[PDB]
Symmetry: C2
Subunit: 337 residues, 2 copies
């Protein structure tokens, strides 16, 4: 759903992005976080994953810059060293809690992927474990090769994202939909521009066919850039121009915000692209903010390195990077507060 | 298209809709205008069609309310009683001239329609006859019955509109795309809401796949209402709420304006729906204006009736209705100037 139900979804979306805030994605599966851990010599125990999250969530002052945190499902069952549920660290700070609800990717046609997990999504939305969650996330990933992303893969993934979106909303959760364009490929920036415009517009088609409440959806999107294996160079301004044009061409006025993923880009580049895009002229209604994992927490991992002695310095790096991303979400990174 | 080419398209779009202005559609084919003529006893001669248009275009002061006029192709070859090309009447007033470029509709599947004319559209855009035109229009029509509009018909028409759009733009013309939802059918307002959201979102998909410059496209859309053969009642406020929600859900920030078609609705209702929609709250970047034929000119035809003695009163009705539509495009119809 009724009017009040819809207004709640809208309000939650706006509360997450208030005052130049963005999202800390901490939702990595054990496998994804494990690979980052192993590179740095940190063993992939549940204990180390729990401690990492606690390090993140207990950072003093983070709520000034972070409007929501995306949790992995295992993290909802976990407590701090002090016995306090990790979700309580975020509730006391007034930060919105989110749950990543996709169950990963499986192969689709030749060389491509779809995301999976819809068949019990409604059930999982109602779980008592996620009672404090007010938003969710679900990721699809688009590989780029010649002739790919195929139109079938775009349609299928967009349809999955949209079905996820409506199920979340009927359960009182604001969905973040993440149609990630995978950086690791060989493709020009021009091609990325064009395909981003195919994906984002088709996504909005599917959201609309499912009668999703658009003011209650957040879009988690890749910057428009060339692929890592390309020898094409770009700058923050060109990324800002191309990404903003793609978004003005495809995202309706009713969407409350776009939250960029860092995607394998520098922390530095992900934040500078955000600032640059927020300096661009071009009337729009949605906020342009962030939903970073790597851009926000790579520095924490590198500083911490499984050594508790390094934790404070790790938290200070998170707070400093969070500040920069928040300034950048308002186009003020060049300006002194 | 280059940067300058695109900025021209954008500027033209904005010039048409400046200061609460809208579009006078005068583009009816001989067959469409003939049927309106016959109802009122006026013979369907070329001379009478020429005189009607002259009556419209020579109305004193119309340029205050009308930013562009859509002409039928035959009208580009026609002169006033005084020997002045009819297009010069509009050029001297500073009104933008447009050309309707579709060649009508043919049958599609069972009970539905597609619009036609793409195969020589590029050629026709370059014709010397349309040299003074700076915009164009192309209409598709969506019949409603059970199970219809079909997804095939939505895709095909949206694809035709988008191909038209890019051809126009490559020729320096701002395209108006008109995905009309036909009023004459039996369907609820709720169903019209849902299908409008299917059509508008799919349209934006196709515009994006064709890499159309979105700030240089105008959308000519039906109000969301129940069908004429329905016994469902609505009011201006409900139409405003439903139509605005459909548009916020589907139309990107980059579109410069939506221009409503009157569609068989009252002149009174078409203008009151416009005013109502412009009184609604909900952040948006595009103007909400009009591209009326019937709502603006039915009164002229009824007053004139093929009798030159009635012409001045006919022109005064056009100027008065134009004023009302302009006030309504700014949400000021209740307010005294």
């Amino acid at each position: 759903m009724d009017c009040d139900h819809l207004l709640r979804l809208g309000m939650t979306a706006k509360k997450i992005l208030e005052n130049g805030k963005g999202i800390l994605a901490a939702d990595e599966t054990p496998k994804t976080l494990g690979r980052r851990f192993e590179k740095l010599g940190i063993t992939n125990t549940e204990e180390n994953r729990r401690k990492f999250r606690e390090i993140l969530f207990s950072t003093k002052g983070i709520e000034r810059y972070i409007g929501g945190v995306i949790l992995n499902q295992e993290t909802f069952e976990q407590t701090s060293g002090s016995g306090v549920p990790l979700t309580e660290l975020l509730k006391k700070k007034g930060i919105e809690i989110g749950i990543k609800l996709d169950k990963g990717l499986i192969d689709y046609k030749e060389k491509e992927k779809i995301s999976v997990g819809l068949e019990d999504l409604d059930l999982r939305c109602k779980s008592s474990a996620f009672k404090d969650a007010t938003f969710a996330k679900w990721r699809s990933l688009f590989y780029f090769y010649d002739g790919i992303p195929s139109e079938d893969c775009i349609n299928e993934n967009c349809s999955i994202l949209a079905k996820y979106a409506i199920i979340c909303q009927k359960n009182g959760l604001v969905p973040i939909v993440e149609p990630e364009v995978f950086l690791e490929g060989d493709y020009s920036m021009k091609r990325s521009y064009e395909v981003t415009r195919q994906i984002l517009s088709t996504l909005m088609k599917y959201l609309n066919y499912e009668l999703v409440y658009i003011p209650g959806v957040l879009i988690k999107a890749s910057y428009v850039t060339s692929g890592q294996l390309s020898n094409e160079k770009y700058t923050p301004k060109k990324v800002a121009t191309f990404t903003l044009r793609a978004l003005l061409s495809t995202i309706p006025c009713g969407i409350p915000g776009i939250v960029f993923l860092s995607g394998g880009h520098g922390s530095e580049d992900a934040i500078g692209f955000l600032n640059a895009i927020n300096m661009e002229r071009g009337c729009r209604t949605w906020s342009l903010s962030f939903s970073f994992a790597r851009a926000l927490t790579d520095g924490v991992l590198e500083t911490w390195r499984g050594d508790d002695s390094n934790i404070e310095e790790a938290q200070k790096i998170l707070l400093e990077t969070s500040f920069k991303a928040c300034r950048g979400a308002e186009g003020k990174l060049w300006d002194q507060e």
